[PDB]
Structure 1
Amino acid sequence: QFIFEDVPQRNAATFNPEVGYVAFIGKYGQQLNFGVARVFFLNQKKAKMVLHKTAQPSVDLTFGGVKFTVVNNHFPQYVSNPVPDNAITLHRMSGYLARWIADTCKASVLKLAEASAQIVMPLAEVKGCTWADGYTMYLGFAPGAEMFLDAFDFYPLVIEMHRVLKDNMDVNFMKKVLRQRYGTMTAEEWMTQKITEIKAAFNSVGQLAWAKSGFSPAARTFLQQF
Structure 2
Amino acid sequence: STGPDFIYDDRPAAVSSTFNPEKGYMDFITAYGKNINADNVRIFFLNHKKAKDSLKGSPKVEVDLQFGTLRVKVVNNHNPRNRDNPVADNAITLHRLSGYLAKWCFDEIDHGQIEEAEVKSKVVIPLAEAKGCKWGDGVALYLAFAPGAEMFLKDFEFYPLAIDIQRVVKDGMDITFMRKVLKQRYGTKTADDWMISEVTAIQSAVKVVAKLPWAKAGFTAAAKNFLAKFNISV
Provide the aligned length of Structure 1 versus Structure 2: 225
Aligned residues: percent identity? 50
User: Which residue of the other structure, out of 106, 109, 115, is the alignment partner of 2:119?
Assistant: 115
Q: Are the counterparts in 1 of residues 11 and 84 from structure 2 also a CA contact under 8 Å? A: no
- The alignment status of 1:45 with 2:49, answered yes or no, reads yes
User: Which residue of the other structure, out of 72, 75, 87, is the alignment partner of 1:68?
Assistant: 72
Q: Are the counterparts in 1 of residues 64 and 72 from structure 2 also a CA contact under 8 Å? A: yes
Query: 1:159 matched to which residue of 2?
Result: 163
Deviation at 1:4, TM superposition (A): 1.7
User: Which residue of the other structure, out of 142, 145, 157, is the alignment partner of 1:141?
Assistant: 145
Query: 2:177 matched to which residue of 1?
Result: 173
Residue 173 of structure 2 aligns to which amino acid in structure 1? M
- Within 2, Cα distance between the matches of 1:204 and 1:219? 21
Q: Summarize deviations over 1:77-130 as a string: whole Å, max 9, x none.
A: 234421110111001000000001101112323222211100100000011101
TM-score normalized by the length of structure 1: 0.92
- Within 2, Cα distance between the matches of 1:86 and 1:127? 33
Runs of 4+ in structure 1 deviating by more than 6 angstroms, as ranges, are: 223-226
User: Which residue of the other structure, out of 14, 32, 37, is the alignment partner of 2:36?
Assistant: 32
State which drifts further: 109-118 or 42-51: 109-118
CA 209–99 in structure 1, closer or farther in 2 if over 3 Å, else same: same
- Structure 2 unpaired stretches of 5+: 1-5
Within 5 Å, give how 1:202-217 maps onto structure 2: 202-216=206-220
Q: Are the counterparts in 2 of residues 126 and 212 from structure 1 also a CA contact under 8 Å? A: no
- Within 2, Cα distance between the matches of 1:186 and 1:82? 24
User: Which residue of the other structure, out of 1, 4, 10, is the alignment partner of 2:9?
Assistant: 4
C-alpha RMSD over aligned residues: 2.1
Deviation at 1:8, TM superposition (A): 6.1
Deviation at 1:193, TM superposition (A): 1.4
Deviation at 1:192, TM superposition (A): 1.9
TM-score normalized by the length of structure 2: 0.89
Q: Summarize deviations over 1:51-88 as a string: whole Å, max 9, x none.
A: 01101121000001221101110112234421110111
User: Which residue of the other structure, out of 196, 199, 224, is the alignment partner of 2:203?
Assistant: 199
Within 5 Å, give how 1:9-28 maps onto structure 2: 9-10=14-15, 12-28=16-32
- Within 1, Cα distance between the matches of 2:230 and 2:158? 42
